[PDB]
């Protein structure tokens, strides 16, 4: 599945367990630290939901889309 | 704040940034792996929300309360 504007940019990533989901969340966290823009991450067994938005703007901005693309890049598909 | 039954057992933990919130989430994850019971974790700047429930029971069980107490213990207040 690709990113969707739900006002936030959201995508869920599937994993075989909790451990791998948490591992991915940590990589997204490192990315957030580097770009000075943080997501809302939801980690549970087999899934990580990543949400990007800009509070001040009350929605999705170019920075959020950049973070979404950098998040997908972490998968190196 | 103490744990509250919202059917799940929920509590939010405050932090000064995202990094420390993620660090705490990882400790809760290790705890979950040891006890074979996993929470739904929400990590964002300055906060980690921890939710415990048992799917099959459709609510909060003794195991969830045990996990809540073990989660607080991680803080070693």
mmCIF file with all atom_site columns, N, CA and C in Angstrom, chain B residues 9 23 43 47-48 73:
data_model
loop_
_atom_site.group_PDB
_atom_site.id
_atom_site.type_symbol
_atom_site.label_atom_id
_atom_site.label_alt_id
_atom_site.label_comp_id
_atom_site.label_asym_id
_atom_site.label_entity_id
_atom_site.label_seq_id
_atom_site.pdbx_PDB_ins_code
_atom_site.Cartn_x
_atom_site.Cartn_y
_atom_site.Cartn_z
_atom_site.occupancy
_atom_site.B_iso_or_equiv
_atom_site.pdbx_formal_charge
_atom_site.auth_seq_id
_atom_site.auth_comp_id
_atom_site.auth_asym_id
_atom_site.auth_atom_id
_atom_site.pdbx_PDB_model_num
ATOM 1  N N  . UNK B 1 9  ? -6.070 -1.206 29.004 1.00 0.00 ? 9  UNK B N  1
ATOM 2  C CA . UNK B 1 9  ? -5.391 -0.587 30.138 1.00 0.00 ? 9  UNK B CA 1
ATOM 3  C C  . UNK B 1 9  ? -4.382 0.364  29.509 1.00 0.00 ? 9  UNK B C  1
ATOM 4  N N  . UNK B 1 23 ? 13.373 5.432  23.389 1.00 0.00 ? 23 UNK B N  1
ATOM 5  C CA . UNK B 1 23 ? 14.191 4.584  24.256 1.00 0.00 ? 23 UNK B CA 1
ATOM 6  C C  . UNK B 1 23 ? 13.291 3.800  25.214 1.00 0.00 ? 23 UNK B C  1
ATOM 7  N N  . UNK B 1 43 ? 4.294  6.254  19.885 1.00 0.00 ? 43 UNK B N  1
ATOM 8  C CA . UNK B 1 43 ? 5.451  7.087  20.165 1.00 0.00 ? 43 UNK B CA 1
ATOM 9  C C  . UNK B 1 43 ? 5.398  8.379  19.369 1.00 0.00 ? 43 UNK B C  1
ATOM 10 N N  . UNK B 1 47 ? 6.218  11.859 24.238 1.00 0.00 ? 47 UNK B N  1
ATOM 11 C CA . UNK B 1 47 ? 5.261  10.966 24.867 1.00 0.00 ? 47 UNK B CA 1
ATOM 12 C C  . UNK B 1 47 ? 5.176  9.577  24.286 1.00 0.00 ? 47 UNK B C  1
ATOM 13 N N  . UNK B 1 48 ? 4.953  8.619  25.174 1.00 0.00 ? 48 UNK B N  1
ATOM 14 C CA . UNK B 1 48 ? 4.742  7.241  24.777 1.00 0.00 ? 48 UNK B CA 1
ATOM 15 C C  . UNK B 1 48 ? 3.444  6.819  25.439 1.00 0.00 ? 48 UNK B C  1
ATOM 16 N N  . UNK B 1 73 ? 7.591  -0.321 36.577 1.00 0.00 ? 73 UNK B N  1
ATOM 17 C CA . UNK B 1 73 ? 8.825  -0.693 37.251 1.00 0.00 ? 73 UNK B CA 1
ATOM 18 C C  . UNK B 1 73 ? 10.055 -0.263 36.453 1.00 0.00 ? 73 UNK B C  1
#
